[PDB]
Amino acid sequence: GSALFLVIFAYLLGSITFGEVIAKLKGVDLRNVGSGNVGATNVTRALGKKYGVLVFFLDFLKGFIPALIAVKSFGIDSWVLTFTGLASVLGHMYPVFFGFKGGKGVATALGVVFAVSPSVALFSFLVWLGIFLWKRYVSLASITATISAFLFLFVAGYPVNVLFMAIVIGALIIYRHRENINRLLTGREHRFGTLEVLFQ
Ligand SMILES: CCCCCCCC/C=C/CCCCCC(=O)OC[C@H](O)CO
Ligand SMILES: CCCCCCCC/C=C\CCCCCC(=O)OC[C@H](O)CO
Ligand SMILES: CCCCCCCC/C=C\CCCCCC(=O)OC[C@H](O)CO
Ligand SMILES: CCCCCCCC/C=C\CCCCCC(=O)OC[C@H](O)CO
Ligand SMILES: CCCCCCCC/C=C\CCCCCC(=O)OC[C@H](O)CO
Ligand SMILES: CCCCCCCC/C=C\CCCCCC(=O)OC[C@H](O)CO
């Protein structure tokens, strides 16, 4: 019973459109700018990195808080954790709040992973940072770091319930990047260059 309530809590906390609450206070509706989605990436597009970092933290806490309750109440080997983390990420991407669409969900997914293993989350972040500084594609770093988190969980000996959670979350994030992949492979993906470092 408490397990079903935690999975529902994870879906509803993960549903919260923090990006939209913060964008509206700055006069912006995120459905009418950039990707049309609510998340740290589209908040960064509309409002810049100061607001982006705040929404990244908040979206991270959407994955972090239910998964930490599941780890502490049920355990790393509980399928309760599996469905709590999946609920947070599907609630972010496809919220109960009809008429909104979540962003690709890297921040929310990272919060889930950090609740399971802070070491895995930091190493996944370091992989992201390495690829980003090398190639200057955001999408390439995110896709590669998402697979890396799965590999680190596998090599570290996390059980099948955790690897199942990681593979499905990973698969959903790669699916949300499908056009980035098509652009990367056809030389159409925008790189993070001097004007992107500087003007905004
Ligand atoms: C490009 C090729 C480079 C070669 C790649 C080899 C990778 C092999 C992994 C070794 C694991 C060593 C121990 C990993 C860290 C570890 O055990 O955890 C730390 C703490 O938990 C947090 O700092
Ligand atoms: C800039 C935005 C990004 C935000 C990123 C940093 C967020 C740090 C939050 C909480 C730390 C509390 C420590 C939690 C410890 C934790 O996860 O413990 C699980 C067990 O280790 C699993 O068994
Ligand atoms: C344990 C490890 C913790 C990890 C700490 C990570 C902190 C990330 C900081 C900012 C995110 C800003 C929001 C993302 C912006 C973004 O992806 O922008 C691409 C767009 O293409 C822009 O046009
Ligand atoms: C299976 C779950 C694993 C999931 C763990 C993810 C890896 C963590 C890496 C970096 C965090 C900072 C990322 C900052 C850039 C960012 O938010 O990028 C958005 C999209 O890639 C834009 O297209
Ligand atoms: C990124 C490559 C994708 C391919 C991975 C290759 C290496 C790791 C293999 C398996 C982990 C399995 C974790 C998922 C377990 C799975 O499918 O769950 C069935 C249930 O356990 C039935 O009860
Ligand atoms: C740790 C992560 C493990 C990952 C496990 C497997 C991941 C692959 C699954 C889905 C990708 C979806 C791709 C859908 C293909 C598709 O619809 O193609 C459209 C074009 O690429 C342009 O729209």
Q: What resolution, expressed in A, was reported for this entry?
A: 1.8
Angle in degrees, 0-180, between the axes of helices 40-47 and 18-25, rounded to the nearest 10? 10
Q: Is 146 in the pocket of ligand 4 (CB under 6 A)?
A: yes
Q: Is 82 in the pocket of ligand 3 (CB under 6 A)?
A: no
Closest-CA residue, ligand 5 atom 22, reads 160
Closest-CA residue, ligand 3 atom 15, reads 41
CA triple 150-185-189, angle to 5 deg: 90
Closest-CA residue, ligand 2 atom 2, reads 57
Question: Helix/strand/coil (H, E, C) string of the chain?
Answer: CHHHHHHHHHHHHHHCCHHHHHHHHCCCCHHHCCCCCECHHHHHHHHCHHHHHHHHHHHHHHHHHHHHHHHHHCCCCCHHHHHHHHHHHHHHHCCCCCCCCECCCHHHHHHHHHHHCHHHHHHHHHHHHHHHHHHCCHHHHHHHHHHHHHHHHHHHCCCHHHHHHHHHHHHHHHHHCHHHHHHHHCCCCCCCCHHHHHCC
Closest-CA residue, ligand 2 atom 19, reads 115
Find the farthest-apart pair of alpha carbons in the chain and give their distance in angstroms, rounded.
Answer: 53
Domain extent for 142: 1-200
Given a contact cutoff of 8 angstroms between Cβ atoms, the answer to whether 176 and 93 are in contact is yes
Closest-CA residue, ligand 2 atom 16, reads 115
Which is the closest atom of ligand 5 to the Cα of 150? 1
Task: Indicate which technique resolved this structure.
Answer: X-ray
Q: How many domains does the chain have?
A: 1
Q: Is 110 in the pocket of ligand 4 (CB under 6 A)?
A: yes
Q: Is 45 in the pocket of ligand 3 (CB under 6 A)?
A: yes
CA of 77 to the centre of ligand 5 (A): 15
